Ligand binder design. Structure first.
Ligand SMILES: *[C@@H]1O[C@H](CO[C@@H]2O[C@@H](C)[C@@H](O)[C@@H](O)[C@@H]2O)[C@@H](O[C@@H]2O[C@H](CO)[C@@H](O)[C@H](O)[C@H]2NC(C)=O)[C@H](O)[C@H]1NC(C)=O
Ligand SMILES: *[C@@H]1O[C@H](CO[C@@H]2O[C@@H](C)[C@@H](O)[C@@H](O)[C@@H]2O)[C@@H](O[C@@H]2O[C@H](CO)[C@@H](O)[C@H](O)[C@H]2NC(C)=O)[C@H](O)[C@H]1NC(C)=O
Ligand SMILES: O=C(NC[C@@H](O)CNCC1CCCCC1)C(c1ccccc1)c1ccccc1
Ligand SMILES: *[C@@H]1O[C@H](CO[C@@H]2O[C@@H](C)[C@@H](O)[C@@H](O)[C@@H]2O)[C@@H](O)[C@H](O)[C@H]1NC(C)=O
Ligand SMILES: *[C@@H]1O[C@H](CO)[C@@H](O)[C@H](O)[C@H]1NC(C)=O
Ligand SMILES: *[C@@H]1O[C@H](CO)[C@@H](O)[C@H](O)[C@H]1NC(C)=O
Ligand SMILES: *[C@@H]1O[C@H](CO)[C@@H](O)[C@H](O)[C@H]1NC(C)=O
Ligand SMILES: [Cl-]
Ligand SMILES: [Cl-]
Ligand SMILES: [Cl-]
Ligand SMILES: [Cl-]
Ligand SMILES: [Cl-]
Ligand SMILES: [Cl-]
Length: 527
């Protein structure tokens, strides 16, 4: 019976047997007044004390979201859909503390991705119990508002200022600072980490002044704010907001009377209309995303990045080999998870219109010109792999690399990795490679469970990754000092060294996707 006194009330956890050991889990602790009623679309409000003992012993509600139904019954898609009830009342967080209760444990705060439209902390591949048991860190994850409920934007107007889900995240970081001391954790040693939109979120907390004092270091997995999907412009946000009013018959003239109208609507009416607020959409469509609100973000972030306006600290950044493949089976012609998707030059050009809709005829041509200069013109996989690389390089790898260059130019230590191992339990087909999001299980130490059908070499890779991640959190240095590991060097803007993670080797390489990223970063923004 482990009851902890938090600043808002007592909470009861539960005991977990992990690897012939023990971990104390606290699941679904509230951290804000539920944003229901007049609180929908508003920034989160601080909780009043409760007198009972809160039973934080099961995952809480996930936040409202549109589920991926593109491959029903398919684990590869459904492993990401929420595994608890959806509710507007969803601002809750979880804590895993090692047993015995530690003294001054480094805290790890996880933020999930999902395109800022979906995601939940209760996912099986976000279970922190392993990291607590193995590395005696404290793992924390929070739920935050996604989609229009968490990012509907009417800038200036506090009834929908934007970035509510980011302010959800930021409230939880606060909760840790005031309470994690009571759990054995060190508020002075908090490492943010996240993946995809979670990773974009982490980069934005590096830029938001109101988050500078709430964490120490940060790890960014396949995601950064400077990626083309991560920030909604003020133009897009208004057309999208206004469109969502038309789709609900909430079009009004007084800007506030519009919000009030959307607040008597049921969550499903708002969820259903989110698809169509963009006329033409891409598969990577973040209909309601982070914006330059003037509260969380004070300027456009690409400027702040360029001019050094961020928390000075260490960062750990990386990407996966085949980031782009996942998106090709969500709309690209000639593709499917159920064949090798050999496409033609015509299907390739067609796919560019899918992923680059509002782009000039000359822009699409330039993408084709730079990726379809093959070594062997006879290779049949040529156009299939090229569309994956296009998507992955444009949407993840080159923005992540550019973030890491820019951030490092102000003197902080950065470390870049390149995850290139395909999971043995990967459910998608093999032509899709080292897919977006399939390092997460390795980072959380799921292959450490022998009773799980993971190969042996996959255990060892997860163990070294979990070491390097934990050593980065505790010490700002992601090394594995004991088992004669390859030393991970700092990313410098000159040499641009990075570390490869695979089961065979661990190599030091330089200047990832060099040719590819001079195109996406120096040529293509001109179009
Ligand atoms: C800004 O939004 C308008 C409205 O777009 C539509 O809104 C809903 C009716 C929705 O269900 C979708 O059909 C649309 O997103 C955009 O105007 C539309 O533009 C498309 C082509 O761009 C045209 O075929 C439609 O007939 C137009 N409909 C209306 C009502 O105007 C407009 O393009 C958006 N501005 C942008 C994207 O810059
Ligand atoms: C690979 O499959 C795609 C996807 O088509 C679907 O999935 C298949 C496995 C099968 O169930 C089809 O009946 C499905 O429609 C194929 O793309 C389709 O190709 C057909 C014939 O060329 C065409 O009529 C459809 O319009 C295409 N649909 C889409 C969405 O692209 C593709 O031809 C297959 N290629 C290979 C090499 O197997
Ligand atoms: O995550 C998207 N939507 C949510 C949902 O519907 C399907 N995603 C599931 C993801 C969960 C976490 C990370 C791995 C997969 C969407 C996206 C947009 C922008 C940036 C990244 C991802 C997307 C669209 C097509 C294929 C994969 C992902
Ligand atoms: C919280 O739970 C209390 C009982 O917990 C029970 O006993 C402990 C030792 C565990 O075994 C647990 O799984 C059991 O359910 C209730 O008495 C109490 O009323 C509950 N509080 C609330 C607010 O529901
Ligand atoms: C924990 O670490 C900080 C420095 O990181 C130190 O000041 C503090 O005294 C330590 N102990 C406790 C109980 O917080
Ligand atoms: C809109 O309505 C609210 C509430 O009645 C009011 O406070 C606000 O001033 C109004 N704005 C305009 C422009 O009429
Ligand atoms: C190093 O090897 C030993 C086995 O001798 C193992 O117990 C330990 O966990 C390994 N450490 C890492 C980080 O792989
Ligand atoms: Cl899984
Ligand atoms: Cl490669
Ligand atoms: Cl050809
Ligand atoms: Cl899996
Ligand atoms: Cl390369
Ligand atoms: Cl060029």
């Amino acid at each position: 019976d482990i009851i902890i006194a938090t600043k808002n009330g007592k909470v009861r956890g539960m005991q977990l047997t992990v690897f012939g050991g023990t971990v104390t889990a606290f699941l679904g602790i509230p951290y804000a007044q539920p944003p229901l009623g007049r609180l929908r679309f508003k920034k989160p409000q601080s909780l009043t004390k409760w007198s009972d003992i809160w039973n934080a012993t099961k995952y809480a509600n996930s936040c409202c979201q549109n589920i991926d139904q593109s491959f029903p019954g398919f684990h590869g898609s459904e492993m990401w859909n929420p595994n608890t009830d959806l509710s507007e009342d969803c601002l809750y967080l979880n804590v895993w503390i090692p047993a015995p209760k530690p003294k001054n444990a480094t805290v790890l705060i996880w933020i999930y991705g999902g395109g800022f439209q979906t995601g939940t902390s209760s996912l099986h591949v976000y279970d922190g119990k392993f990291l607590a048991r193995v590395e005696r860190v404290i793992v924390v994850s929070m739920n935050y508002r996604v989609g229009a409920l968490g990012f509907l934007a009417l800038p200036g107007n506090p009834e929908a200022p934007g970035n509510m889900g980011l302010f959800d995240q930021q409230l939880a970081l606060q909760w840790v600072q005031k309470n994690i001391a009571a759990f054995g954790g060190n508020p002075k040693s908090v490492t943010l980490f996240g993946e995809s939109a979670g990773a974009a979120s982490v980069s934005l907390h590096l830029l938001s002044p109101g988050s500078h004092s709430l964490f120490t270091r940060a790890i960014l997995q396949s995601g950064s704010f400077n990626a083309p999907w991560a920030v909604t412009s003020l133009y897009e946000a208004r057309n999208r907001t206004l469109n969502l009013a038309k789709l609900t018959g909430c079009s009004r003239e007084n800007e506030t009377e519009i919000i009030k109208c959307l607040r008597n609507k049921d969550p499903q009416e708002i969820l259903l209309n989110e698809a169509f607020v963009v006329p033409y959409g891409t598969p990577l469509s973040v209909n309601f995303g982070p914006t330059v609100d003037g509260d969380f973000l004070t300027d456009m972030p690409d400027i702040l990045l360029e001019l050094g306006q961020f928390k000075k600290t260490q960062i750990l950044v990386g990407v996966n080999k085949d980031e782009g493949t996942a998106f090709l089976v969500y709309g690209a012609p000639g593709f499917s998870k159920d064949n090798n998707s050999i496409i033609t030059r015509k299907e390739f050009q067609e796919g560019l219109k899918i992923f680059f809709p509002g782009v000039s005829e000359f822009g699409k041509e330039s993408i084709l010109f730079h990726y379809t200069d093959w070594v062997d013109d006879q290779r049949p996989e040529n156009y299939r792999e090229a569309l994956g690389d296009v998507v992955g390089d444009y949407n993840f790898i080159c923005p992540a690399l550019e973030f890491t260059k820019k951030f490092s130019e102000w003197g902080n230590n950065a470390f870049f990795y390149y995850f290139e191992h395909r999971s043995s339990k990967l459910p998608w087909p093999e032509w899709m490679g080292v897919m977006h999001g399939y390092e997460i299980e390795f980072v959380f130490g799921l292959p450490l469970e022998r009773r799980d059908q993971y190969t042996k070499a996959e255990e060892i890779l997860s163990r070294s990754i979990v070491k390097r991640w934990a050593n980065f959190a505790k010490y700002g240095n992601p090394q594995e000092t004991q088992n004669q590991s390859t030393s991970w060097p700092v990313f410098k803007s000159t040499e641009q060294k990075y570390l490869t993670l695979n089961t065979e080797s661990t190599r030091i390489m330089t200047k990832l996707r060099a040719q590819q990223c001079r195109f996406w970063t120096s040529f293509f923004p001109k179009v």
